[PDB]
Design a protein around this ligand. Structure first.
Ligand code: NAG
Ligand code: NAG
Lengths: 625, 610
């Protein structure tokens, strides 16, 4: 290609992006213009390209490459619905995105049209004088954060840290030293009102002030027991909505000291002022609280987060409730990658289409796409590219007509191929519109002898589904280039699930039937092979993890998978003891299996949602004293 | 041995106890008498033996066997200080004592002089119509509880169930079904005021009423978050002491319905005029239990007794047989505190002592690990001294009390003050990671390595003397063998790495760590044999998970070193993190500490949280 109008910064950015896309040999005149987010016009190898904001050059080039593969004449104009579109990576659930992968992610977000890159870090950034904060977690140094931000700046992409200034600090407050314990209210919540807490928070902002950015998400979601622990012991019973405002004021004051403009998750206002303590609800605002909120609302952007609703009207109602507090709002949607090993791009697509309608209908200026990693970060960081492309398409075009072509330009894969990554969750009898159904994870981590999720399995449909999935994913792996690792991991997982889905039930059927030959084959053949397959899965998982993330946090997966392997060994040994006539009965197998949960009991499929490792793996105590 | 004066019941009991003690070739005349708890006299192969309470026959027999080893003429008289002496086994922390082992424990308690046997069961007894209560936990059936109680009765020992009627029901309330969730306030706490909660509690007493006993410990400590969860959302703010009162009244009413008389922990009374009056009313219906496992001085117990007596004189004392700090008990520390507690209980007219055998965080210590602590409490009750401790112990077990107490060794680091509780290197040295050894500051390899090595040899020798108890010492010998190398393996990896001594890193990765894994798998085998001997199979799974996890982490240490050695890694990031103190709890002229949650020993990462 021959470009005119480019700055050195822009030519360098394009050099980097040539690692993702091939620019045709054509002539392109590039200028900034307020006329459109993106405009591309021309024919016969001579083109005029304009962008409104500098970062939008990179989506413009993605569109260019795409459109020119087919046609000679180009007529493209896009007007983005959102002033800012962000992707937030969870770096607090054990998986800290490594610097090299943050760079890759930035390049991709640039090509997609995102303005903003965000990292969610509860304790995973280093604070001078707080040596337990992020200790052995791979917390980013100030230097690493600076390097990441400066790399985003190469593409005119803004960096926004998402931190926690109230709750969700469990990995820090666990440390049994005076300087940490003195900071606690209860659970994962800091002690409102305590000077040492505000010293800590001043440290947080001191660290972030080393960056160029002066935009921050300060957290404050999900502090359900706020004011009810050591706070209650010291202060007695207080108005908790005012308590929230008091803490918020002090944090905004600290932010001000460093020149930051803040956003926060909105849920605690709703939980503390609704009838049943829930988010998705209307609120009675006490007068003294209203007055306090009327001040504070001018100093912070409230972020309404919702990853779940299947209809615009459901989001709309919540936006309406938020308007009672503030018209300075943003929306956080979901790239579903927090339900085990396997994402749910399909469900993310369904909710994105409807959330986009509601955001537009409520003149929402910013959408943050969230990539949470609940309970260990076991899903791949790059597993949700389709979901990111979907939101970009919805902002820029208000439809998904360009989704597959732009996605193929950006990744080398069709969007439908890449979205097969979801397969371990896609049981055939599920409706598309229910969230969190995650057999990928609970079929994997379930015990053998004591399979407490067995009532949720449907082997006649699930076995062939997982088996077919493994073949499909093996095929996509072969044409996935640099993303092949993602698919190889999923293929092996599905291969394991195909047999593991009912091995526990088949053991019980054979035991009840006195089919000792079957018992023997399971214990001597099937289970040692299952261990072999799990060890291979562990290797592939580790390869994936170390490619994307820092090493810290992988230890939890080692522990979990080692435990699973040992429990398979126990199934083998207990069966052998019984077969050698050294047991009259195998007591584990005499316990009748109950439903694990009734969450989806009223629905016409067996699968469910089960997303805590420690309750998947055992009915015994493991966490409690 | 020829006896006169025995019933059929007593004859059969003695026949069982021959499994434990060797009755010499003498004639013994047995009668009940109020003159003493135990009296024995006679000479030249003719003896007169008296007991006050029927169960005390069995301690008397142990005393008799003992003295006659030494002498012909006997003049024994004991007056026990406590009306009741109980041992309470924890069956809620994953380890549910199996029926055969409960029988063994009863036999030993009878020989020692215990009047009462207790099982602590949060969710580990079955309630008809509550299928999730004890599900996959090895919950005792009604019939199993009856059989255990009946066995105790064979020796005139009474049974007391220890249950929970408000909080500490974590293993039950986790179940995500309507019939369970509607019973919940928050965390491990049931929902006060909910009629379905009182339906459950009625169910609890319906099960226990199948027993002969009408004495129960109902739990009822003061959990901080009572009233603060789904209670707060449903009902607004209430005085939470007043809430405790309302719930306690309902529980007591249910217990009355079934004829039970209740004990409970004294916590909620420790300390609004509405509340004072309510508390005062309820205190008349219960015996309070003051529990203390920690104090090193009678003076400190006495202070707490005085304070309790401002609340109620209807008071019992719970002491501690330290078996809740990992794999290895602390009989030594239990002896220290028993001596002082006994002084204080006597000074304050305490009528009942309950020795507690908690199994905190997985039940990994052997059920029979604390026999010395139990004999200690018996001697203190009956004789007010330990001058006959070892001789009586050896009659009962085959082992001197000093030999048996070597079971503690994995905790007994040389530079520890004997009077500080919960220092448990047995556990955190074992479960600590290799690459990220977050307890390394608490290790003193130059002292700890030979201590653990010498312990393993000592324990191998005691195993040979231990008969039916050998399994306990075999387990502990192997643990100490492991800890001798593991205590500093992470540190030696860091040293070799920092010195760029690749030969040493290779030796550690290729020889030492695979051998460590082999040793841990050996320990796992021995531990499993020990567990299955003493306990139901349920709960063993948690140990399998924890140990399989540790093995996999040792594998990671091997593989990370291999990749580095091969040039495919510029650095091993885990090894570049400076290790801080794990806790400042005992920050001191020793480095050891207390760390008793597996999940925080094993990783600085999240593992339970969302
Ligand atoms: C602000 C927010 O969304 N908070 C939590 C988040 O930590 C969790 O990871 C996510 C996905 O389950 O949803 C919420 O429960
Ligand atoms: C009444 C009582 O003793 N309650 C707990 C008990 O559940 C625990 O196992 C034990 C040993 O640490 O100490 C107490 O805190």
């Amino acid at each position: 290609v021959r470009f005119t109008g480019l700055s050195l910064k822009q030519t360098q950015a394009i050099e980097v992006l040539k690692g993702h896309i091939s620019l045709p040999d054509v002539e392109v005149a590039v200028t900034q213009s307020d006329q459109a987010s993106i405009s591309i016009e021309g024919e016969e190898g001579h083109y005029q390209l304009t962008y409104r904001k500098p970062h939008q050059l990179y989506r413009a080039l993605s569109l260019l490459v795409t459109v020119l593969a087919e046609a000679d004449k180009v007529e493209i104009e896009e007007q983005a619905a959102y002033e800012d579109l962000a992707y937030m990576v969870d770096c607090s659930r054990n998986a800290v995105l490594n610097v090299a992968s943050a760079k890759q992610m930035i390049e991709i977000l640039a090509l997609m049209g995102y303005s903003t890159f965000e990292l969610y870090m509860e304790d995973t950034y280093q604070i001078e004088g707080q040596p337990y904060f992020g200790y052995f977690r791979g917390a980013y140094s100030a230097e690493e954060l600076q390097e990441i931000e400066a790399y985003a700046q190469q593409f005119d992409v803004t960096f926004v840290p998402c931190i926690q200034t109230l709750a969700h600090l469990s990995a820090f407050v666990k440390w049994g030293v005076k300087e940490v314990q003195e900071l606690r209210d209860v659970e994962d919540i800091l002690l409102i009102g305590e000077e040492k807490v505000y010293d800590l928070i001043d440290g947080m902002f001191a660290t972030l002030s080393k960056l160029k950015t002066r935009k921050v998400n300060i957290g404050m979601d999900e502090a359900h027991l706020v004011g009810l622990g050591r706070y209650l012991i010291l202060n007695g019973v207080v108005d908790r909505s005012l308590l929230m405002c008091q803490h918020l004021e002090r944090v905004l004051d600290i932010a001000d000291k460093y020149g930051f403009h803040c956003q926060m998750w909105s849920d605690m206002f709703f939980k503390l002022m609704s009838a049943d303590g829930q988010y998705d609800r209307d609120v009675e605002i006490p007068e003294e609280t209203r007055v306090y909120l009327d001040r504070l609302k001018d100093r912070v952007t409230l972020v309404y987060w919702d990853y779940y609703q299947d209809s615009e009207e459901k989001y709309n109602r919540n936006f309406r409730n938020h308007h009672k507090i503030s018209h300075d709002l943003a929306f956080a949607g979901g790239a579903w990658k927090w339900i085990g090993f396997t994402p749910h791009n399909h469900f993310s697509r369904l909710v994105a289409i409807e959330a986009n309608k509601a955001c537009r209908a409520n003149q929402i200026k910013e959408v943050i796409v969230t990539g949470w990693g609940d309970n260990g970060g076991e899903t791949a960081q790059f597993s949700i590219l389709p979901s990111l492309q979907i939101w970009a398409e919805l902002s820029y075009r208000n439809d998904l007509d360009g989704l597959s072509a732009h996605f193929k330009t950006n990744t080398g894969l069709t969007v439908e191929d890449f979205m097969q990554i979801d397969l371990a969750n896609l049981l055939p009898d599920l409706p598309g519109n229910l969230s969190g159904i995650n057999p990928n994870r609970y079929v994997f981590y379930q015990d053998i002898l004591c399979p407490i999720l067995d009532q949720h399995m449907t082997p006649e449909q699930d076995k062939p589904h997982f088996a077919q999935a493994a073949e499909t994913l093996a095929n996509i792996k072969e044409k996935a280039g640099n993303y092949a690792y993602l698919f190889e991991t999923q293929a092996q997982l599905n291969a394991i699930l195909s047999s593991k889905v009912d091995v526990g039930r088949r053991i019980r059927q054979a035991y009840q039937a006195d089919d000792k030959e079957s018992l023997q084959q399971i214990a001597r053949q099937e289970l040692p092979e299952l261990r072999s397959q799990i060890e291979d899965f562990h290797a592939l998982f580790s390869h994936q993890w170390l490619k994307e993330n820092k090493v810290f946090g992988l230890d939890t997966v080692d522990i979990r998978m080692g435990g699973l392997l040992q429990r398979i060994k126990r199934a083998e040994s207990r069966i052998e003891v019984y077969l050698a006539g050294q047991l009259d009965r195998i007591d584990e197998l005499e316990v009748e299996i109950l439903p694990f949960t009734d969450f989806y009991a009223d629905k016409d499929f067996a699968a469910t949602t089960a997303n805590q490792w420690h309750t998947i793996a055992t009915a015994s105590t493991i966490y409690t004293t």
